[PDB]
């Protein structure tokens, strides 16, 4: 039993509040899907009445991405601009008692405005919304209850984070995980129940999947399994993770700031760039479907080895700009599914390179792009393991797990040879160096 493996006392009480936090982060995820899915649908519904006209079916597939997107940004800027971005670097920046947890103005700001960004068709994750929806949850029931103390405001923290990304997900291991590999910071230690942690995940993840028929985000069937002979490859596959990965990162912070320079804070300017960038994506989001969009889509596509070679890289390409595009705008939405998308492309390219060149080997493309699709995650986020577990939840090929570790290992070990960081870390620090800067 993993039971015994945890019998450390924290107050019931607080463990209580962990099933209230987990259950109502649960309900937060599915509402919100339900409601992204439902404006994608109003938006797929003009497009067919105006089928006959196709000119119009492009400044429709333009407007009505732009709008939405603008109702998001306008939030954001109005009314919480911490709900920018993925914010989870906030939730960090919370348990590490140095950000607040306005979860008055950011749950409904969150929550709409990702609702307008990802109902747009944006390249931008459920993950951030729910993550940070899901911590400040956590400190909502923490100052309902009037509870006292760090344990009880650390944990019931963490346990809205860790629910909120099992949620996004239906991948309970990956939520506990991820507080203690990247959430949690060392060196200036914290109070975190682990019993909690589990309780809430446990109670969110039923509750996707009481509201998910019983489907798969992800369905790439069963693949093959990885030959001993076969294992340096994967290592190749990591260190090329490795180099990418803070080259990616500089991109990303970068991109935050060459964009802010379009608008310089101004709320009508920033809203307005925002609308474009909304608006480019929905027309994208039509024209070329698998440059736009989440990223779950074209993940089954590439996997079964549907793509070419040529379109793979025409995807990739394409792809890293409108990611570094909707997020470093500053955006409501995470930048977490699309290191899954790009990480799978990248993977299932480096396949089909190494199938023709090691014509001896017995290679299926399909398992580089499974070990691809969590390395983005090891080499940027540098949270390898969470990576490998959610890649492993999510695509049930429980087979790979050995050549997925030394693909992130070699990922990991060459973004830190490289001098890269955490990207949580550095957007944080980020933050944390402007708010000292006017003191
Ligand atoms: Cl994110």
Same mark, same amino acid.
Request: glycine share 12%.
């Given at each position: ?39 994608? &649908? ?10 006959? &006209? ?10 009505? =991405? ?31 008692? !140095? ?59 963490? #346990?809205?984070?860790?629910? +909120? ?28 129940? @682990?019993?909690?942690?589990?309780? +809430? ?23 093959? %399994? ?22 990616? &990162? ?6 935050? %700031? ?23 994506? +929905? ?21 079964? +080895? ?15 700009? #409108? *990611? ?35 014509? !001896? ?8 792009? @499974? ?23 999510? *695509? ?28 949580? =870390?550095?957007?944080?620090?980020? #933050?944390?160096?402007? !708010?000292?800067?006017?003191?």
């Amino acid at each position: 039993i993993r039971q015994l493996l945890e019998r450390d006392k924290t107050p019931l009480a607080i463990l209580f509040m962990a099933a209230v936090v987990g259950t109502l982060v649960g309900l937060a995820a599915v509402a919100f899907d339900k409601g992204v899915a439902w404006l994608q &649908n109003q938006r797929m519904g003009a497009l067919v009445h105006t089928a006959d &006209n196709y000119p119009l079916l492009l400044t429709v597939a333009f407007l009505c =991405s732009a709008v939405l997107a603008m109702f998001g940004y306008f939030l954001v800027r109005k009314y919480a601009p911490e709900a920018g971005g993925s914010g989870i670097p906030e939730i960090e920046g919370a348990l590490e008692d !140095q950000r607040p947890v306005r979860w008055w103005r950011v749950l409904p700001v969150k929550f709409f405005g990702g609702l307008g960004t990802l109902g747009g068709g944006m390249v931008l994750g459920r993950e951030g919304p729910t993550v940070q929806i899901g911590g400040n949850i956590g400190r909502m029931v923490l100052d309902i209850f009037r509870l006292k103390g760090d344990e009880a405001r650390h944990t019931l923290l963490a #346990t809205g984070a860790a629910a +909120g990304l099992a949620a996004a997900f239906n991948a309970p291991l990956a939520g506990i995980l991820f507080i203690w590999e990247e959430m949690r910071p060392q060196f200036r230690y914290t109070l975190i129940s @682990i019993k909690a942690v589990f309780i +809430g995940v446990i109670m969110s993840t039923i509750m996707y999947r009481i509201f998910n028929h019983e489907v798969a985000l992800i369905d790439v069937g069963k693949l093959s %399994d990885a030959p001993l002979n076969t294992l340096w490859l994967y290592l190749i596959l990591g260190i090329i993770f490795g180099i990418f990965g803070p080259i990616f &990162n500089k991109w990303v912070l970068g991109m935050q %700031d060459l964009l802010h320079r379009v608008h310089g804070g101004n709320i009508t300017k920033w809203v307005l760039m925002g609308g474009a960038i909304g608006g480019l994506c +929905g027309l994208l989001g039509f024209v070329a479907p698998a440059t736009s969009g989440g990223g779950f889509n074209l993940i089954p596509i590439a996997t079964a +080895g549907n793509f070419s070679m040529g379109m793979l890289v025409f995807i990739f390409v394409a792809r890293v700009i #409108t *990611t570094l595009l909707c997020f470093s705008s500053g955006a409501p939405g995470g930048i977490f599914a699309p290191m899954l998308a790009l990480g799978t492309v990248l993977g299932t390219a480096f396949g089909m390179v190494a199938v023709e060149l090691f014509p !001896q080997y017995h290679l299926e493309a399909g398992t580089f792009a @499974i070990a691809g699709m969590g390395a983005l995650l090891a080499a940027s986020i540098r949270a390898p393991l969470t990576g490998i577990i959610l890649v492993l939840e999510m *695509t049930d090929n429980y087979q790979l797990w050995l050549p997925m570790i030394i693909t992130g290992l070699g990922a990991t070990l060459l973004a830190q040879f490289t001098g890269g960081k955490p990207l949580y =870390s550095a957007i944080l620090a980020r #933050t944390l160096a402007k !708010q000292e800067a006017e003191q």
